[PDB]
Design an enzyme around this catalytic site. Structure first.
Site, PDB file in Angstrom:
ATOM      1  N   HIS A  14      40.120 -59.425  11.568  1.00 21.10           N
ATOM      2  CA  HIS A  14      39.584 -57.812  11.923  1.00 21.10           C
ATOM      3  C   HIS A  14      39.540 -57.210  13.759  1.00 21.10           C
ATOM      4  O   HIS A  14      38.772 -56.644  13.990  1.00 21.10           O
ATOM      5  CB  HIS A  14      39.031 -57.427  10.977  1.00 21.10           C
ATOM      6  CG  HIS A  14      39.190 -55.800  10.973  1.00 21.10           C
ATOM      7  ND1 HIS A  14      38.975 -54.735  11.754  1.00 21.10           N
ATOM      8  CD2 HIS A  14      40.450 -55.578  10.494  1.00 21.10           C
ATOM      9  CE1 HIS A  14      39.376 -53.739  11.453  1.00 21.10           C
ATOM     10  NE2 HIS A  14      40.485 -53.446  10.681  1.00 21.10           N
ATOM     11  N   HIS A  39      44.319 -58.917   5.636  1.00 24.31           N
ATOM     12  CA  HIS A  39      43.569 -57.955   6.876  1.00 24.31           C
ATOM     13  C   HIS A  39      43.808 -58.476   7.564  1.00 24.31           C
ATOM     14  O   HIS A  39      42.789 -58.064   8.821  1.00 24.31           O
ATOM     15  CB  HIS A  39      42.844 -56.812   6.782  1.00 24.31           C
ATOM     16  CG  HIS A  39      43.172 -55.567   7.136  1.00 24.31           C
ATOM     17  ND1 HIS A  39      44.254 -55.035   7.543  1.00 24.31           N
ATOM     18  CD2 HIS A  39      42.315 -54.759   6.442  1.00 24.31           C
ATOM     19  CE1 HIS A  39      44.110 -53.424   8.534  1.00 24.31           C
ATOM     20  NE2 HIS A  39      42.691 -53.626   8.384  1.00 24.31           N
ATOM     21  N   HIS A  58      40.335 -47.087   3.091  1.00 28.39           N
ATOM     22  CA  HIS A  58      38.921 -47.508   3.893  1.00 28.39           C
ATOM     23  C   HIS A  58      38.064 -48.077   2.385  1.00 28.39           C
ATOM     24  O   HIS A  58      37.892 -47.401   1.881  1.00 28.39           O
ATOM     25  CB  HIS A  58      38.593 -47.492   4.971  1.00 28.39           C
ATOM     26  CG  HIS A  58      38.858 -47.439   5.782  1.00 28.39           C
ATOM     27  ND1 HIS A  58      40.690 -46.747   6.295  1.00 28.39           N
ATOM     28  CD2 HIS A  58      40.007 -48.577   7.073  1.00 28.39           C
ATOM     29  CE1 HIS A  58      41.581 -46.519   6.878  1.00 28.39           C
ATOM     30  NE2 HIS A  58      40.868 -47.644   7.733  1.00 28.39           N
ATOM     31  N   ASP A  65      42.284 -50.681   2.662  1.00 33.68           N
ATOM     32  CA  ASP A  65      42.320 -52.040   3.830  1.00 33.68           C
ATOM     33  C   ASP A  65      39.944 -51.632   3.818  1.00 33.68           C
ATOM     34  O   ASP A  65      39.317 -51.156   4.391  1.00 33.68           O
ATOM     35  CB  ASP A  65      42.002 -51.221   5.676  1.00 33.68           C
ATOM     36  CG  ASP A  65      43.655 -51.744   5.348  1.00 33.68           C
ATOM     37  OD1 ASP A  65      44.482 -51.802   4.644  1.00 33.68           O
ATOM     38  OD2 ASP A  65      43.957 -50.547   6.472  1.00 33.68           O
ATOM     39  N   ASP A  66      39.506 -53.255   4.719  1.00 32.11           N
ATOM     40  CA  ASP A  66      38.559 -54.009   5.294  1.00 32.11           C
ATOM     41  C   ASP A  66      37.756 -54.206   4.725  1.00 32.11           C
ATOM     42  O   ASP A  66      36.548 -54.529   4.630  1.00 32.11           O
ATOM     43  CB  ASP A  66      37.905 -52.739   6.083  1.00 32.11           C
ATOM     44  CG  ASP A  66      38.693 -52.193   6.723  1.00 32.11           C
ATOM     45  OD1 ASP A  66      39.777 -52.520   7.244  1.00 32.11           O
ATOM     46  OD2 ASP A  66      38.251 -50.980   7.798  1.00 32.11           O
ATOM     47  N   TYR A 109      43.819 -51.856  12.906  1.00 36.04           N
ATOM     48  CA  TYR A 109      44.345 -50.929  13.973  1.00 36.04           C
ATOM     49  C   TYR A 109      45.214 -50.280  13.911  1.00 36.04           C
ATOM     50  O   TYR A 109      46.047 -49.252  14.312  1.00 36.04           O
ATOM     51  CB  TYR A 109      43.522 -51.069  15.709  1.00 36.04           C
ATOM     52  CG  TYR A 109      42.423 -51.995  15.029  1.00 36.04           C
ATOM     53  CD1 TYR A 109      40.929 -51.156  14.584  1.00 36.04           C
ATOM     54  CD2 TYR A 109      41.492 -52.938  15.214  1.00 36.04           C
ATOM     55  CE1 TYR A 109      39.659 -51.305  14.452  1.00 36.04           C
ATOM     56  CE2 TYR A 109      40.728 -53.203  15.288  1.00 36.04           C
ATOM     57  CZ  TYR A 109      39.596 -52.594  14.922  1.00 36.04           C
ATOM     58  OH  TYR A 109      38.139 -53.398  14.610  1.00 36.04           O
TER      59      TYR A 109
HETATM   60 CO   LIG Z   1      41.250 -51.904   8.948  1.00 40.77          CO
END
Ligand SMILES: [Co+2]
Length: 205
Positions: free
Chosen positions: A65, A61, A152, A10-11, A102
């Site tokens: 965010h 995602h 992540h 993620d991210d 989240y």
């Molecule tokens: Co995230």
């Protein structure tokens, strides 16, 4: 008797992503990257191109965010469309999965997002106070056949970069085969496209 694991990140994309890719390439392993739409730009193009070259799956995602339980239906839909079209128009691949920022999800999101929701097992690699070796052990302890594992690759998450070689080596030592999320559902013969559901394992339990 194949035992499938879906390593997911993620991210990104971020410069840290490139270090994750170096390791995935070294071990011949594919992963799935749930991208933040506003991180899809000319600064990250070459990383996303390399992700596609290596057969890593690109997923959504959201665009900004934010906690999408505090968003209107329209704004949720815009976030999803802009993220998918940014990924399609930049490097030519079609988002198939969404992971909520989240892991915050409510009815409005489920009603207004047309992709399967993915959660997976967290290894708590968003906080620096979680050591390299804690990250290793959490990933190894979360593994089971069909499981999705959430890591992540935001900028600076070097402790997950440090942890990743032990994780891959250890899961192979346990007989697991690494797959993308698309490959996970394809190979188990499971339809992920179930509304109002969030998946952590191809068995849906
Ligand atoms: Co995230």
């Amino acid at each position: 008797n194949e035992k499938l694991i879906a390593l997911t990140f993620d991210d990104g994309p971020s410069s840290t992503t490139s270090d994750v890719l170096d390791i995935l390439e070294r071990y011949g392993v594919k992963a799935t990257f749930f991208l933040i739409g506003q991180n899809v730009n000319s600064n990250t193009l070459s990383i996303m191109q390399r992700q596609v070259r290596m057969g890593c799956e690109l997923a959504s995602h959201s665009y900004t965010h934010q906690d999408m339980t505090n968003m209107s239906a329209q704004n949720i839909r815009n976030e999803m469309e802009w993220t998918s079209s940014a990924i399609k128009n930049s490097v030519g691949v079609d988002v198939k999965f969404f992971r909520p920022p989240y892991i915050a999800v409510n009815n409005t999101m489920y009603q207004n997002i047309d992709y399967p929701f993915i959660q997976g097992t967290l290894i708590n690699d968003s906080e620096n106070s979680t050591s390299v070796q804690q990250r290793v052990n959490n990933a190894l302890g979360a593994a089971k056949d069909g499981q999705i594992i959430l890591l992540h690759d935001f900028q600076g998450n070097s402790q997950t970069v440090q942890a990743l070689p032990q994780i891959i080596e250890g899961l192979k030592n346990q007989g697991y085969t690494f797959v993308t999320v698309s490959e996970l559902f394809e190979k188990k013969g499971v339809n992920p496209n179930v509304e109002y559901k969030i998946w952590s394992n191809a068995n849906g339990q």
